């Protein structure tokens, strides 16, 4: 029993983190097979960052300009290419600790673990969601760029995120491992405002199920609703719309608890309209939206 | 910028987790050097758990009765002893992945990372505090016993917790790595009630400093207080007393933010008396007490 914001064990990713230096810029790289992936802005002076032309900046760079260090041993760079907003540095040594891995582009509402790194050295691990505005609310100081987000399926690491940017509002933007930004963000020190950070409705419902499973039941009401009625209320409160795909996904939690999804929707509706009245659910005074239904099932079942 | 509940990278501890089986009971063990540490209740039938005599139960056990598996390879047990509420199983192989380590007994309010394990396999990592009532609020299913809590100082893992028990209220109890329970709990399926789960005042203050550092300043008031005045209010709200040792410990956060500790106390006092009025601090609707001052400095500075 008990329910925690839980990251994947980070060991498999710890074994992939290296330091990348280009001139005076140091950040982190991900070493898989004989390729090191890092944010292309490693080649910029903070001066360059205001309106960088990366193709033109890259012409001035050689393999020997990229200094790649794995522990306290240097890797030999034998090639470099730009793919979207990441650099791929070919090194002469396959990472001996390369895990089984995939590159995946996640959808808004999907959760993942971040291994926060500085100078290629892991500092911490936390759980995130891709926000509906394609930002994440991370913890990232200078030097944390190239830190990655991942899910693990038994022994296969799915890399979904590389850290590139902090927006002027102190939220975070980055790319998948093909170098494509989540949302409309660009690796340039310019005015970039995020859209509405809506609540991930399907995730709140999952977490309400987690609460029932763990004995927190005070919020369970006598009402039901319809998708359309619930969705009217969701919009008013800056909650993402709930689809039938979300209802289907919650099916196993519905089954385990014997609470129909639309009943749990009507409980959520009353919590939106009435608030928590100073009460807590799973030790939170607000509705948590950074657990997926899959996360709740994993943690409530005990997958390794 | 940004502030997350952050666990230590778990790789060094992942490399120490094994499966321990005695008869039909499977749980986790910690393999350091040529010793495997596990909860002594591995020797009990759930029937034994009602009033176990562990010395008498252990007489009926041999080295060959303890099945220790590290990945899918069996370790040979060449000795076993009981130290308090843990078993130490001497195996014929030193763990090749043993990190530098210490055993430390933490104080209430101290935070640590838990690597939740099932059948010797890591499932997740989260950050905890030892509660003032010597419980922890974990996430632990059947088979999670022998999962450990740790801090890391660069390359040295300090093991502070091994998981043994869930109380009938679904909070968690366990031992240090010398087998001594935190608080008054015993490894017996009997009536064990926790005392008052008070809020860790010094930790809330640290987190209020973290909030100021990260731009959340709305709660900063025009008042100050004294330790004695603040402490009267703390007691009324089930907050731990604040000592001069706590004020001294917050000194560096006081310095960084230019907010005197007693000023931040007076801000906390107003939040206790007035509540949050539907506002959030670092995305929480309640006051977080599971960051130490050391945690706030680490995450705000970027230690690896
Ligand atoms: O639903 C809302 C409630 C309040 C504010 C903003 C929104 C828009 N949310 C939204 N989710 C989407 C998913 C796919 C495509 C477009 C989407 N727009
Ligand atoms: O302060 C309180 C406010 C409300 C309820 C309970 C308490 C007691 N808290 C407490 N912390 C201690 C630390 C060391 C020794 C004894 C201690 N008692």
From Swiss-Prot, chains A, B:
Q: What does this protein do?
A: Cleaves the C-terminus of replicase polyprotein at 11 sites. Recognizes substrates containing the core sequence [ILMVF]-Q-|-[SGACN]. Cleaves and inactivates human TRMT1, preventing tRNA guanine(26)-dimethylation of tRNAs. May cleave human NLRP1 in lung epithelial cells, thereby activating the NLRP1 inflammasome pathway. May cleave human GSDMD, triggering alternative GSDME-mediated epithelial cell death upon activation of the NLRP1 inflammasome, which may enhance the release interleukins 1B, 6, 16 and 18. Also able to bind an ADP-ribose-1''-phosphate (ADRP).
The consequence of residue 49 to A is: Does not affect ability to cleave and inactivate human TRMT1
The activity regulation comment is: Inhibited by pyridone-containing alpha-ketoamides compounds 13a and 13b. In turn, alpha-ketoamide 13b (tert-butyl (1-((S)-1-(((S)-4-(benzylamino)-3,4-dioxo-1-((S)-2-oxopyrrolidin-3-yl)butan-2-yl)amino)-3-cyclopropyl-1-oxopropan-2-yl)-2-oxo-1,2-dihydropyridin-3-yl)carbamate) inhibits SARS-CoV-2 replication in human lung cells. Inhibited ex vivo by michael acceptor inhibitor N3. Inhibited ex vivo by compound 11a and 11b.
Identify which residues the record assigns to the active site.
Answer: 41, 145
Q: Where in the cell is it found?
A: Host cytoplasm; Host Golgi apparatus; Host nucleus
Query: How is this protein named in the record?
Result: 3C-like proteinase nsp5
Note the residue range shown relative to the complete protein. 3264 to 3567 of 7096
**What is this protein's gene name?**
rep
Q: How does it assemble?
A: 3CL-PRO exists as monomer and homodimer. Only the homodimer shows catalytic activity. Interacts with host FBXO22; this interaction promotes the proteasomal degradation of nsp5.
Q: Where is the Peptidase C30 domain?
A: 1-304
Q: Which residues lie on this side of the membrane: Cytoplasmic?
A: 1-304
Impact of changing residue 189 to A on the protein?
Does not affect ability to cleave and inactivate human TRMT1
Q: What is the effect of changing residue 142 to A?
A: Does not affect ability to cleave and inactivate human TRMT1
Q: Where is this cross-link: Glycyl lysine isopeptide (Lys-Gly) (interchain with G-Cter in ubiquitin)?
A: 5, 90
Q: Impact of changing residue 90 to R on the protein?
A: In strain: Beta/B.1.351
Q: Which reaction does it catalyse?
A: TSAVLQ-|-SGFRK-NH2 and SGVTFQ-|-GKFKK the two peptides corresponding to the two self-cleavage sites of the SARS 3C-like proteinase are the two most reactive peptide substrates. The enzyme exhibits a strong preference for substrates containing Gln at P1 position and Leu at P2 position
């Amino acid at each position: 029993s008990g329910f925690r914001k839980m990251a994947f064990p980070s060991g498999k990713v710890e074994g992939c983190m290296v330091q990348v230096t280009c001139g005076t810029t140091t950040l982190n790289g991900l070493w898989l097979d004989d390729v090191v992936y890092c944010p292309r802005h490693v080649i910029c002076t903070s001066e360059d960052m205001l309106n960088p032309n990366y193709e033109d900046l890259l012409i001035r760079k050689s393999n020997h300009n990229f200094l790649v260090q794995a522990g306290n041993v240097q890797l030999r760079v034998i090639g470099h290419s730009m793919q979207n907003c990441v650099l791929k540095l070919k090194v002469d040594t396959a990472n001996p600790k390369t895990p089984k891995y995939k590159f995946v582009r996640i959808q808004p509402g999907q959760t993942f673990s971040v291994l926060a790194c500085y100078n290629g050295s892991p500092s911490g691990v936390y759980q995130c969601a891709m926000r509906p505005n394609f930002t994440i609310k991370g913890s990232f100081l200078n030097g944390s760029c190239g830190s990655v987000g991942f899910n693990i399926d038994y022994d296969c690491v799915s890399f979904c995120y590389m850290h590139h940017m902090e927006l002027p509002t102190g939220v975070h933007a980055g790319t998948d491992l093909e170098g494509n930004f989540y949302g409309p963000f660009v690796d340039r020190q310019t005015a970039q405002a995020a859209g509405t950070d809506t609540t991930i409705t399907v995730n709140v419902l999952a977490w309400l199920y987690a609460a029932v499973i763990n004995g927190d039941r005070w919020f369970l009401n006598r009402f039901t609703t319809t998708l359309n009625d619930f969705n009217l209320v969701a919009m008013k409160y800056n909650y993402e719309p709930l689809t039938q795909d979300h209802v289907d996904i919650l099916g196993p939690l519905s089954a385990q608890t014997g609470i129909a999804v639309l009943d749990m929707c009507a409980s959520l509706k009353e919590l939106l309209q009435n608030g928590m009245n100073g009460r807590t659910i799973l030790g939170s005074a607000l509705l948590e939206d950074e657990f997926t239904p899959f996360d709740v099932v994993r943690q409530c079942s005990g997958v390794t």
